[PDB]
Amino acid sequence: PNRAPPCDSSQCVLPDCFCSEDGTVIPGDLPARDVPQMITITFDDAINNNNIELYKEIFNGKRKNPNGCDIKATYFVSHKYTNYSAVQETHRKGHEIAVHSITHNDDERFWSNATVDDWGKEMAGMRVIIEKFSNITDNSVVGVRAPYLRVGGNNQFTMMEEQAFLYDSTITAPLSNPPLWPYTMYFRMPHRCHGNLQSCPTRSHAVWEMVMNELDRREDPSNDEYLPGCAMVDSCSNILTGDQFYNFLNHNFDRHYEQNRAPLGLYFHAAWLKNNPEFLEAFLYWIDEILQSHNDVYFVTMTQVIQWVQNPRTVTEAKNFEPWREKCSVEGNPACWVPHSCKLTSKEVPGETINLQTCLRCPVNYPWLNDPTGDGHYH
Ligand SMILES: *[C@@H]1O[C@H](CO)[C@@H](O[C@@H]2O[C@H](CO)[C@@H](O)[C@H](O)[C@H]2NC(C)=O)[C@H](O)[C@H]1NC(C)=O
Ligand SMILES: *[C@@H]1O[C@H](CO)[C@@H](O)[C@H](O)[C@H]1NC(C)=O
Ligand SMILES: [Zn+2]
């Protein structure tokens, strides 16, 4: 069929398209020593009072990138139990909001075999929920990450192109040295389809892939002992102490910083940090140590990585790069002082009553797959 061809650097030109033969080449062929080391901290799943205080402790308005702006993270938000006033405030503070589906269906075979329409209802539907109940009007909800990192073959990416999503961050790249830069899906993936029973795209799709490089979990990377990598931090099951986590962060930082400076992805679940105080303590110690010692390291959103790829800036130029200064150091007031607490039901979620907090008036129905606005209208 129309299998995407291997990367052709002649018809894949910035800013629409970026590829290299193995995914390790730096955009714009900048020297590695002049490339800012980007770090994309991300958090999956619901934003609510289970984790709102954790995010305040991390993103305290005192941790700043070398451009003077607050460090920024990306939230892949799933619908159930999410507080949309909190999503709105997180966005107001300059963090990126992306979608992680409505249902977070735990049947992994559903995702790997879902139709284009199924992917659309889950992901475009979740975008509708966020844009409405968090009142986000600037079309900045543009990223997708699938539950359980289940890639949806071509169907997922056909959906994302039809729905005008900017990027996916579901595809894992096996532990590699050097690690991989993001790539667009117009051309063949520069690495194997990785993971149990994974179905990866094969055709050309006008979608960016914020590829998830596995991290090296080896406690002593000096051997030649071989261990599978890990993409989600909490899937690195040998990390048991704060000291191990601290060394793990340094080792994988160095892997990126000392090679091709590919963006380093630190992909979290809030609960993993919250339930393990020594991990949170080690993480913050590490962040603060990296920020003080590096004038060339930026904690940025996923969209901000793509913006750099589209217009590569050296470390010196990065200080005044305007996309990285959007919502530089937001203070101000929340969109509403006391959000509505909506107790909602829906025949799509039979039995449950789910509280949804929003600055908007409560909808008549609990939003779900077949009614993402919660308006209860007939179709
Ligand atoms: C939902 O999230 C919002 C936003 O963080 C929380 O809103 C706070 O609500 C209290 C009410 O006691 C107000 O005093 C604050 O001004 C609000 N904060 C902001 C930043 O607007 C709300 O408490 C959350 N509710 C639940 C149930 O999770
Ligand atoms: C969304 O935010 C704008 C900007 O503050 C505000 O004027 C508008 O009323 C909000 N929309 C809704 C439906 O609350
Ligand atoms: Zn999830």
Pairwise CA distance, residues 64 & 120, whole Å: 37
Q: Is 51 exposed, middle or buried (0-12, 13-18, 19+ CB in 10 A)?
A: buried
Element (H, E) at 43: strand 37-44
Please provide residue 327's backbone torsions phi and psi, each rounded to the nearest 5 degrees.
45, 55
* Residues, CB within 5 angstroms of ligand 3 (ion): 44-45, 147
Give the DSSP letter of residue 214.
P
- CA–chain centroid gap for 141, Å, is 11
Token pair of 86 as six digits:
């909190």
If you take atom 4 of ligand 1, which residue's CA is the nearest one? Answer: 86
CB-based contact 110:160 (threshold 8 Å)? no
Q: Is 303 exposed, middle or buried (0-12, 13-18, 19+ CB in 10 A)?
A: buried
Element (H, E) at 355: strand 354-358
Q: Which ligand is nearest to the CA of 333?
A: 1
CB-based contact 367:373 (threshold 8 Å)? yes
Binding region for Zn(2+):
45, 100, 104
Length of the chain (residues): 379
Q: Which ligand is nearest to the CA of 357?
A: 1
Token pair of 73 as six digits:
């993270």
Terminal C-alpha separation, the chain: 36
CB-based contact 148:114 (threshold 8 Å)? no
If you take atom 10 of ligand 2, which residue's CA is the nearest one? Answer: 135
Cα dist from 102 to 81, 118, 369, whole Å:
11, 11, 7
Experimental method of this PDB entry: X-ray
Q: Which long-range contacts (CB under 8 A, 24 or more apart) does 322-329 make?
A: 324/65, 324/67, 324/69, 324/298, 324/300, 325/67, 325/69, 326/94, 327/72, 327/92, 327/93, 327/94, 328/67, 328/68, 328/69, 328/70, 328/94, 329/61, 329/64, 329/68, 329/69, 329/70
If you take atom 21 of ligand 1, which residue's CA is the nearest one? Answer: 334
Give the DSSP letter of residue 291.
H
Pairwise CA distance, residues 152 & 149, whole Å: 9
Please provide residue 135's backbone torsions phi and psi, each rounded to the nearest 5 degrees.
50, 55
- Partners of 232 in beta bridges: 267
Other C-beta atoms closer than 10 Å to the C-beta of 115 total: 12
Token pair of 120 as six digits:
């659309």
Tell me the CA–centroid distance for residue 150 and ligand 2, in Å.
35
Say yes or no: CB of residue 135 within 6 Å of ligand 2. yes
Q: Which long-range contacts (CB under 8 A, 24 or more apart) does 353-360 make?
A: 354/80, 354/81, 355/81, 356/82, 356/83, 356/84, 356/133, 357/83, 357/84, 357/85, 357/86, 358/84, 358/85, 358/133, 358/134, 359/84, 359/85, 359/88, 359/135, 359/335, 360/84, 360/132, 360/133, 360/135
Pairwise CA distance, residues 99 & 378, whole Å: 25
CB-based contact 179:260 (threshold 8 Å)? yes
Other C-beta atoms closer than 10 Å to the C-beta of 91 total: 22
> Which of 83, 84, 362 maximizes ligand 1 atoms within 8 Å of its Cβ, making it the mutation to test the pocket?
83
Tell me the H-state helices in 134-269. Answer: 153-162, 242-257
Q: Reduce the DSSP state of residue 210 to 3 states and report it.
A: coil
Q: What residue ranges line ligand 1, CB within 6 angstroms?
A: 48-49, 52, 83, 85-86, 89, 334, 337-339, 357
Q: Resolution in angstroms for this experimental structure?
A: 2.0
Give the CB-side neighbour count of residue 71, counting CA atoms within 13 A.
24
Pairwise CA distance, residues 109 & 196, whole Å: 11
Element (H, E) at 303: helix 302-310
Token pair of 171 as six digits:
């595809």
Say yes or no: CB of residue 149 within 6 Å of ligand 2. no
- CA–chain centroid gap for 110, Å, is 22
For every residue of 3-17, DSSP letters joined together read BPPS--TTT--TTT-
Closest-lying ligand 1 atom to the alpha carbon of residue 335: 21
**Parallel, antiparallel, or unpaired for β 354-358 and 340-344?**
antiparallel
Pairwise CA distance, residues 112 & 309, whole Å: 29
Q: What is the dihedral of CA 190, 184, 29, 98, to 10 degrees?
A: -120
**Parallel, antiparallel, or unpaired for β 208-209 and 143-144?**
unpaired
What are the residues whose beta carbons fall under 8 Å from the beta carbon of 368, sequence distance 6 or more? 79, 102, 103, 346, 348, 349
The residue whose two tokens read 């630190």 is: 266
Taking the CA atoms of the chain, what radius of gyration do you get in angstroms? 20
Token pair of 197 as six digits:
């029973």
Binding region:
45, 100, 104
Q: Reduce the DSSP state of residue 111 to 3 states and report it.
A: helix
Strands (E) in 65-211, as ranges, are 74-77, 96-99, 143-144, 167-168, 172-173, 183-184, 208-209
Pairwise CA distance, residues 111 & 199, whole Å: 10
- CA–chain centroid gap for 116, Å, is 21
